[PDB]
């Protein structure tokens, strides 16, 4: 019916990390401050070149 060329296709995919999650940092009062970046969750937020996601392809 709908299949007309014997596909192996029309299947799932991914988008999620192109919808990058905004994060709300510390606002805690003084003296009540915790070393909340003690984990590895501190990246150099750097925007060197290329697109994001599926626009960014190569050979």
């Amino acid at each position: 019916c709908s299949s007309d060329s014997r596909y192996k296709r029309q299947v799932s995919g991914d988008e999620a990390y192109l919808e990058a999650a905004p994060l709300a940092e510390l606002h805690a009062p003084a003296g009540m401050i915790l070393p909340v970046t003690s984990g590895d969750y501190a990246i150099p937020v750097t925007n060197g070149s290329g697109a994001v996601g599926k626009a960014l392809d190569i050979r």
């Binding site: 990058a20 970046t37 925007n47 060197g48 070149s49 290329g50």
Partner: protein, 218 residues
């Protein structure tokens, strides 16, 4: 696959089927090219095209060996930024691949082993190459990734509240605190440490958190 042929025509058949989308048969060229010519000039780029083709043909451990190969074969190379990105991009796709997303089912509560390994590579990209052709891309991963690993540990730390393990509530969300300074899963964990304190009669310690609740409400 391809017999002992001119190395370019195997690559030409590869560059055909790379651009045909026939990674079913591009990998039939690119491996057979690397079968007898891995020492050729583009044969390192064949491995880079293998990582390209393994990903589009969903061959992630075969990509991972090839990415690890290019770590060893070319530890001095311009396309290590590609190799560093595609390792985490594998570890993106290796971590979760279920079709439940159309049903809206969360997979951040699913195991982030490669998502932690992508948190190495995407961050080792923006560390090791903060300028590269994938650095705008990899930063978008880590911003999404940081709350994703948080919502993992949030869904863990939710259960001790459901278990009533208030000792295991606090140290998990303190784990969420010290790891994640900013994630909303930790921001939603911000009321919960206050609660377990009150269940452990640390109301005075809770009201200090309640000011942090008050400070980090917005």
């Amino acid at each position: 696959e391809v017999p002992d042929n001119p190395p370019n025509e195997i690559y030409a058949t590869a560059q055909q089927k790379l651009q045909d989308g026939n990674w079913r048969q591009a990998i039939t060229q690119l491996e057979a090219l690397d079968n007898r010519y891995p020492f050729g000039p583009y044969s390192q780029q064949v491995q880079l095209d293998l990582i390209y083709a393994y990903y589009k043909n969903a061959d992630l451990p075969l990509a991972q060996a090839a990415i690890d190969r290019f770590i060893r074969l070319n530890p001095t190379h311009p396309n290590i930024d590609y190799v560093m990105y595609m390792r985490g991009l594998t570890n993106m796709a290796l971590d979760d691949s279920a079709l439940q997303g159309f049903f809206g089912v969360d997979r951040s509560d699913r195991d982030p082993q490669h998502a932690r390994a992508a948190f190495s590579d995407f961050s080792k990209l923006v560390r090791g190459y903060p300028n590269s052709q994938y650095t705008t891309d990899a930063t978008k991963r880590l911003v999404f990734l940081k709350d994703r690993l948080a919502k993992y540990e949030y869904s863990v730390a939710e259960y001790y509240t459901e278990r009533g393990a208030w000792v295991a509530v606090v140290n998990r969300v303190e784990g969420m605190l010290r790891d994640y300074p900013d994630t909303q899963a930790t921001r939603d964990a911000l009321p919960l440490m206050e609660n377990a304190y009150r269940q452990m009669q640390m109301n005075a310690q809770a009201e200090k958190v309640a000011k942090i609740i008050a400070a980090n409400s917005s």
